[PDB]
Design an enzyme around this catalytic site. Structure first.
Site, PDB file in Angstrom:
ATOM      1  N   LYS A  18      98.382 -45.775 -27.299  1.00  0.00           N
ATOM      2  CA  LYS A  18      96.964 -45.403 -28.130  1.00  0.00           C
ATOM      3  C   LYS A  18      96.107 -45.279 -28.074  1.00  0.00           C
ATOM      4  CE  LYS A  18      95.002 -47.548 -31.797  1.00  0.00           C
ATOM      5  NZ  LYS A  18      95.408 -47.756 -33.274  1.00  0.00           N
ATOM      6  N   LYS A  37      96.809 -46.255 -15.422  1.00  0.00           N
ATOM      7  CA  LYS A  37      97.655 -46.827 -17.257  1.00  0.00           C
ATOM      8  C   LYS A  37      95.523 -46.310 -17.039  1.00  0.00           C
ATOM      9  CE  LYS A  37      99.013 -49.169 -21.448  1.00  0.00           C
ATOM     10  NZ  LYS A  37     100.284 -48.769 -21.892  1.00  0.00           N
ATOM     11  N   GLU A  86     103.676 -50.986 -11.182  1.00  0.00           N
ATOM     12  CA  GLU A  86     104.417 -50.221 -10.459  1.00  0.00           C
ATOM     13  C   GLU A  86     104.460 -48.983 -11.312  1.00  0.00           C
ATOM     14  OE1 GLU A  86     107.281 -53.333 -10.966  1.00  0.00           O
ATOM     15  OE2 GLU A  86     109.615 -52.349 -10.131  1.00  0.00           O
ATOM     16  N   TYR A  87     105.528 -48.002 -10.387  1.00  0.00           N
ATOM     17  CA  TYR A  87     105.849 -47.151 -11.190  1.00  0.00           C
ATOM     18  C   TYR A  87     107.395 -46.929 -11.273  1.00  0.00           C
ATOM     19  CZ  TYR A  87     107.761 -42.115 -10.169  1.00  0.00           C
ATOM     20  OH  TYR A  87     108.495 -40.416 -10.043  1.00  0.00           O
ATOM     21  N   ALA A  88     107.638 -47.109 -12.770  1.00  0.00           N
ATOM     22  CA  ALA A  88     108.915 -46.768 -13.492  1.00  0.00           C
ATOM     23  C   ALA A  88     109.536 -45.121 -12.777  1.00  0.00           C
ATOM     24  CB  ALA A  88     109.151 -47.381 -14.002  1.00  0.00           C
ATOM     25  N   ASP A 131     107.208 -58.947 -29.407  1.00  0.00           N
ATOM     26  CA  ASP A 131     108.468 -58.156 -29.833  1.00  0.00           C
ATOM     27  C   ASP A 131     108.334 -57.278 -28.622  1.00  0.00           C
ATOM     28  OD1 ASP A 131     106.145 -56.142 -30.499  1.00  0.00           O
ATOM     29  OD2 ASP A 131     107.160 -55.226 -32.155  1.00  0.00           O
ATOM     30  N   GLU A 135     111.005 -48.618 -26.287  1.00  0.00           N
ATOM     31  CA  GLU A 135     109.069 -47.395 -25.319  1.00  0.00           C
ATOM     32  C   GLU A 135     108.517 -48.323 -24.821  1.00  0.00           C
ATOM     33  OE1 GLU A 135     108.662 -48.881 -29.435  1.00  0.00           O
ATOM     34  OE2 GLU A 135     110.330 -47.747 -29.510  1.00  0.00           O
ATOM     35  N   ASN A 136     108.914 -49.993 -24.330  1.00  0.00           N
ATOM     36  CA  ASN A 136     108.370 -50.557 -23.306  1.00  0.00           C
ATOM     37  C   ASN A 136     109.880 -50.661 -22.912  1.00  0.00           C
ATOM     38  OD1 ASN A 136     105.729 -50.086 -25.460  1.00  0.00           O
ATOM     39  ND2 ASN A 136     106.173 -52.035 -26.449  1.00  0.00           N
TER      40      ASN A 136
END
Ligand SMILES: OCCNc1ncnc2oc(-c3ccccc3)c(-c3ccccc3)c12
EC number: 2.7.11.1
Length: 260
Positions: A18, A37, A86-88, A131, A135-136
């Site tokens: 967002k 990001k 870090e790239y996942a 929470d 998505e996270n």
């Protein structure tokens, strides 16, 4: 460690947030592949979270765990802030769920094991996650779960993943995280969260009453673990070690329960 945007080659967008986009990127001198990001300063001010972010980034930098998404650094310009992550490579557990529709008990058990370990570790640092949503949850190259959002605290939005104490406006602690595991364990197995509803106000009521039911295909051991975790009273929630040493978990998981 003063980085600048000119230090990176930017690649494809990995997805939207967002507050900003996330891009594949590579550090020019080293060729280190990572994620960038991009958060717009105006929005962070406007929403008044800019200080939220600050707190979380400070917590984040202090975390070293294979099941926690690493934050390498940050920098900013006039218009925006930048998190170097870090790239996942294997995406979110959310996408995997959309594609697979629901998970088998061995993938679920493995993810709950990895989440529980990550959280044991956070609890040991007096760190509690807000929470936790699919998505996270990101996936590394060998498909290891990584907790990617900085929603921690030492001390909405959709309600689906929030515990009753956090919606009922009460006192919340480390047990919040235990609730999270229960919501995720159900969602992994069934394909949607147990309190899903067509409206905020609905979902509010389901959570506050702890009103859910199981599909026939959910087994007794899963059921037992989820019922024990989805407890209106936090103190009735098991501890992370009891989750790690649950027969359903030890029977189905591919990873062992690092406590240690
Ligand atoms: O703070 C987490 C920022 N996001 C990321 N950070 C670090 N690595 C990442 O890999 C992804 C990603 C990986 C492969 C496929 C698609 C996405 C994403 C990604 C970004 C936004 C929304 C969805 C997923 C990602």
């Amino acid at each position: 460690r003063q980085w600048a945007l000119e230090d990176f080659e930017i690649g494809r967008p990995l997805g939207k947030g967002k507050f900003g986009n996330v891009y594949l990127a590579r550090e020019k001198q080293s060729k280190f592949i990572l994620a960038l990001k991009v958060l717009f300063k105006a929005q962070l001010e406007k929403a008044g979270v800019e200080h939220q972010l600050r707190r979380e980034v400070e917590i984040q930098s202090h975390l070293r765990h294979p099941n926690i998404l690493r934050l390498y650094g940050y920098f900013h310009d006039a218009t925006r802030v930048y998190l170097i992550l870090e790239y996942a490579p294997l995406g979110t557990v959310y996408r995997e769920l959309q594609k697979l529709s629901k998970f088998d008990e061995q993938r679920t058990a493995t993810y709950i094991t990895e989440l529980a370990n990550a959280l044991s570790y956070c609890h040991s640092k007096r760190v509690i996650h807000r929470d936790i949503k699919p998505e996270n949850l990101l996936l590394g190259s060998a498909g290891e779960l990584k907790i990617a959002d900085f929603g921690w605290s030492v001390h909405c939005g959709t309600l689906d993943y929030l515990p009753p104490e956090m919606i009922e406006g009460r006192m919340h602690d480390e047990k919040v995280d235990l609730w999270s595991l229960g919501v995720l364990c159900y969602e992994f197995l069934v394909g949607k969260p147990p309190f899903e509803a067509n409206t905020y106000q609905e979902t509010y009521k389901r959570i506050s009453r702890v009103e859910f039911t199981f599909p026939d295909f959910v087994t007794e051991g899963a059921r037992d673990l989820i019922s024990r975790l989805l407890k209106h009273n936090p103190s009735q929630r098991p501890m992370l070690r009891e989750v790690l040493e649950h027969p359903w978990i030890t029977a189905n998981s591919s990873k062992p329960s690092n406590c240690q």
